[PDB]
């Protein structure tokens, strides 16, 4: 949980409590993963359950902790 929360805070550059798709591109691109805007749209749409177009802490946990 702390690893996921700390990681979630690391991607929330503005501390808004929500990770934007472009923010995902920043972390994924520097993390060594280069995704296109559509590939991130797929990850956002799959992890975005409220269709808000962004990943919140609960969605991030399920997407990375998808049991
Ligand atoms: Ca943010
Ligand atoms: Ca969402």
From Swiss-Prot:
| Modified positions (N6-methyllysine) in chain numbering | 34
Disease implicated? Ventricular tachycardia, catecholaminergic polymorphic, 4: An arrhythmogenic disorder characterized by stress-induced, bidirectional ventricular tachycardia that may degenerate into cardiac arrest and cause sudden death. Patients present with recurrent syncope, seizures, or sudden death after physical activity or emotional stress. CPVT4 inheritance is autosomal dominant.
Q: What is the effect of changing residue 8 to L?
A: In LQT14; significantly decreased of KCNN2 calcium-activated potassium channel activity; not changed KCNN2 expression; not changed KCNN2 location at membrane; decreased thermal stability in presence of calcium ions; decreased interaction with RYR2
- Residue positions of the PTM Phosphothreonine? 29
- Oligomer and partners: Homotetramer. Interacts with MYO1C, MYO5A and RRAD. Interacts with MYO10. Interacts with CEP97, CCP110, TTN/titin and SRY. Interacts with USP6; the interaction is calcium dependent. Interacts with CDK5RAP2. Interacts with SCN5A. Interacts with RYR1. Interacts with FCHO1. Interacts with MIP in a 1:2 stoichiometry; the interaction with the cytoplasmic domains from two MIP subunits promotes MIP water channel closure. Interacts with ORAI1; this may play a role in the regulation of ORAI1-mediated calcium transport. Interacts with IQCF1. Interacts with SYT7.
Q: Which residues carry this modification: N6-acetyllysine?
A: 13
The entry's comment on post-translational modification says: Ubiquitination results in a strongly decreased activity.
Biological role? Calmodulin acts as part of a calcium signal transduction pathway by mediating the control of a large number of enzymes, ion channels, aquaporins and other proteins through calcium-binding. Calcium-binding is required for the activation of calmodulin. Among the enzymes to be stimulated by the calmodulin-calcium complex are a number of protein kinases, such as myosin light-chain kinases and calmodulin-dependent protein kinase type II (CaMK2), and phosphatases. (Microbial infection) Required for Legionella pneumophila SidJ glutamylase activity.
Instruction: Please list the residues that carry the modification Phosphoserine.
Output: 20
Report the protein name in the record.
Calmodulin-1
Q: Which residues carry this modification: N6,N6,N6-trimethyllysine?
A: 34
Limits of the EF-hand domain: 1-34, 35-67
The record's misc note reads: This protein has four functional calcium-binding sites.
The record lists the organism as Homo sapiens (Human)
Reproduce the free-text note on domains from the UniProt record.
The N-terminal and C-terminal lobes of CALM bind to the C-terminus of KCNQ1 in a clamp-like conformation. Binding of CALM C-terminus to KCNQ1 is calcium-independent but is essential for assembly of the structure. Binding of CALM N-terminus to KCNQ1 is calcium-dependent and regulates electrophysiological activity of the channel. The C-lobe interacts with KCNN4 channels in a calcium-independent manner, whereas the N-lobe interacts with the S4-S5 linker of KCNN4 in a calcium-dependent manner playing a role as calcium sensor and gating the channel.
Q: Which positions in this protein are listed as binding Ca(2+) 3? A: 12, 14, 16, 18, 23
**Family classification:** Belongs to the calmodulin family.
